[PDB]
């Protein structure tokens, strides 16, 4: 489905959304709840811990800057700018929370390149699916199993 540059990742959600003493135990912190598939585009990363919230953070700067310019103008807030910005911020937050906490990270296990650079030379314009079929028949599952964290058997 990816039209241009990107990657399809086989990831493993890290069950360490506590954030307390995080990244201090290479086994207690390396535990995977469930596996997922994720698509990244151009130079996007599959981790999601170093980039989640970026838009929410920039959104809060914009509102504060606009609110401070409004104070200079001398305005009586607004009927629905405090209720719209609030909703935009409340949704931005609720959509990035984790099961317990808001520290959701992912452990790369596999990655398939979608960029035409990889498959255009050998397979042609019409052979992306042929490329992806031969990619599946060329995956060394040993390397992937190696990257796999240990299951979080909280159950």
């Amino acid at each position: 489905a990816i039209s241009g540059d990107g990657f399809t990742w086989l990831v493993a959600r890290r069950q360490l959304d506590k954030r307390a003493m995080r990244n201090d135990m290479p086994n207690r912190d390396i535990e995977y709840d469930k596996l997922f598939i994720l698509n990244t585009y151009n130079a996007g990363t599959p981790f999601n811990f170093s980039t989640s919230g970026v838009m929410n953070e920039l959104n809060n700067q914009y509102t504060n800057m606009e609110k401070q310019r409004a104070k200079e103008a001398g305005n009586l807030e607004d009927s629905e700018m405090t209720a719209k910005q609030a909703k935009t911020k409340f949704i931005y937050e609720t959509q990035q929370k984790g099961f317990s906490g808001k520290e959701v990270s992912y452990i790369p296990l596999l990655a398939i390149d979608a960029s035409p650079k990889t498959w255009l030379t050998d397979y042609g314009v019409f052979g992306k699916r042929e490329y992806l079929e031969r990619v599946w028949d060329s995956i060394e599952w040993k390397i992937v199993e190696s990257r796999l964290p240990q299951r979080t058997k909280i159950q």
Partner: protein, 71 residues
């Protein structure tokens, strides 16, 4: 939210989300706009979280939601 009182005999209210009627489970308490609005509760829009969606043999979709309230 369609009803201002949980479905009789059931511990869940009913919501109208995207052309489907779902069963909404609340975190702990029911927002106070319920009692205030009353039978006109359907006149207001709330934000929900869709937990899961199942399919029954009658050909219906069993959508379970959660009344996300501003906090």
């Amino acid at each position: 939210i369609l009803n201002v009182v949980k479905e009789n005999n059931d511990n869940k209210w009913l919501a109208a989300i995207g052309g489907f009627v779902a069963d909404v489970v609340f975190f702990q308490s029911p927002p106070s706009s319920f009692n205030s609005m009353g039978d006109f509760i359907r006149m207001k829009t709330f934000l929900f979280e869709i937990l899961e969606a199942s399919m029954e043999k009658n050909g219906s979709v069993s959508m379970h939601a959660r009344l996300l309230e501003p906090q």
